[PDB]
Symmetry: C3
């Protein structure tokens, strides 16, 4: 039961680390937090409201996992000299697909609002 | 691969079992409630997302442990970043269930 | 705007790599355009059309993050000469749950529409 408070602190510590270190996290988080607020104040149904929010929050989840992968690569880079960067490319690709998805979700749903 | 990973996640990780139960409860409750298709999908997939992220989080932790059990700044950062992603998935899941059930 | 062009180039470098390296991604890539076409060809509402696409997109995202983890393990595997499959299994386990989710989504939604 106390493992929750322990894991909560780690999560909060990871959020700060993401925010402090990753620049892509800060900019995306801004556009994400903006989108979340708008979705909370639109004239739409629950299914649409959720779809707008979740597609946007997915960008943050992927970006957080991308940063974790990059931190792993950096850990390797401190002990090893050659870095292909292939792992960071795949992580950057994953964030792109998540963003494109969020763009599509919003365009499609708002085209019903119109 | 796939099943070997699900078997290892269920046996060793405890939070994964609390999501596995939650997934079944999600599916059960989503089907027992008189809701539309999109709502039922949203209740299920939002919970399964938490599991998906949890699996990826555990995978990242495994790599870190393999690099070494040695305490480094980037080793703990990677684990905290992974742990943070699982949080957002849960937050997303909680928000999802709220909006859908509030409208009921 | 200079960072964006570089980040996108990384993402494209990551996608171009995933397409050539893994055949699983090629399959999922085909499925996406197929899902988009099927979602648009069918006369369905916006909420469902989004879920039909987002579910398949999620698989491609999880695959990319998995391939990123697989790449890190290989960089390590070359240095350590060890092959512990904890990471690779958990990564593929994640993709499995994603695919299962995509099937449930397509079932529940299309079962309702027809
Ligand atoms: N090698 C390391 N270097 C630095 N910090 C580390 C570390 N290993 C663990 N930590 C720190 O301790 C915390 C707990 O480690 P870890 O996140 O792997 O536990 P966990 O709660 O996920 C247990 P389980 O593997 O059963 O799920 C991490 O979030 C991190 O803050
Ligand atoms: C059809 C009209 C309405 C369209 C509605 C679309 C909504 C998209 C939702 C979320 C954005 C997710 C990605 C956020 C990316 C943030 C980073 C960014 O764009 O940064 C630019 C910056 O200038 C670089 O320095
Ligand atoms: C209506 C509500 C609007 C709310 C505000 C929304 C603003 C942002 C929207 C679209 C820009 C999308 C730009 C996408 C650029 C992707 C670049 C890329 O590849 O990024 C990889 C990433 O940096 C690896 O970490
Ligand atoms: Zn763990
Ligand atoms: Zn952890």
């Amino acid at each position: 039961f106390t493992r929750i408070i322990k894991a909560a602190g780690y999560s909060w510590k990871g959020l700060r680390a993401a925010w402090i270190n990753e620049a892509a996290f800060r900019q995306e988080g801004v556009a994400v937090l903006l989108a979340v607020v708008i979705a909370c104040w639109l004239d739409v149904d629950a299914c649409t409201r959720v779809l707008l929010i979740s597609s946007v929050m997915l960008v943050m989840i992927v970006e957080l996992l991308n940063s974790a992968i990059e931190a792993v690569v950096d850990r390797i880079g401190s002990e090893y000299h050659e870095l292909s960067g292939r792992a960071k490319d795949l992580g950057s690709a994953a964030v792109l697909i998540a963003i494109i998805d969020a763009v599509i979700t919003w365009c499609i749903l708002l085209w019903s609002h119109f």
